[PDB]
Amino acid sequence: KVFGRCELAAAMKRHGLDNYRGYSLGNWVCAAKFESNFNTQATNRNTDGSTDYGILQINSRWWCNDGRTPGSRNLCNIPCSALLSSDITASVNCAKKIVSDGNGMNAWVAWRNRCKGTDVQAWIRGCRL
Ligand SMILES: [Cl-]
Ligand SMILES: [Cl-]
């Protein structure tokens, strides 16, 4: 599914991401925009053989099992394909574990390079939330 900006903002809010570990909703929407262009089916392969999955491009080296990343830790205890669903619950639940692990949203390279330190509230402007 390819979300609209406000649709995704609203879904993320319902799933408890607004201000989760101090990260306002716009951070999450901005991260999803640049990680996946709001496409839950986005995948990207990395040089190390791992693959990033879904709207928040969660990586198979640490977080989900895709059966082809040797040494994966599967810390979210899910198959990576679960992260591609039109239902974002699995991605959100896993993201909450990621953002809690010490490095906050710096785990998302696009967030660090394209969202952090910008006016992220712009990503939810105009939305009925
Ligand atoms: Cl915000
Ligand atoms: Cl980037």
Curated annotation (Swiss-Prot):
Primary gene name: LYZ
Similarity field: Belongs to the glycosyl hydrolase 22 family.
Name the record gives this protein: Lysozyme C
Protein purpose: Lysozymes have primarily a bacteriolytic function; those in tissues and body fluids are associated with the monocyte-macrophage system and enhance the activity of immunoagents. Has bacteriolytic activity against M.luteus.
Cited SUPFAM superfamilies: Lysozyme-like
An annotated Gene Ontology molecular function: identical protein binding
Superkingdom field: Eukaryota
Tissues of expression: In the egg white and polymorphonuclear leukocytes.
Disulfide linkage: C6-C127, C30-C115, C64-C80, C76-C94
Gene3D superfamilies: 1.10.530.10
Key words of the record: Allergen, Antimicrobial, Bacteriolytic enzyme, Disulfide bond, Glycosidase, Hydrolase, Secreted, Signal
Catalytic activity: Hydrolysis of (1->4)-beta-linkages between N-acetylmuramic acid and N-acetyl-D-glucosamine residues in a peptidoglycan and between N-acetyl-D-glucosamine residues in chitodextrins
GO CC list: cytoplasm; endoplasmic reticulum; extracellular space
Active site positions, chain numbering: E35, D52
EC identifiers of the protein: 3.2.1.17
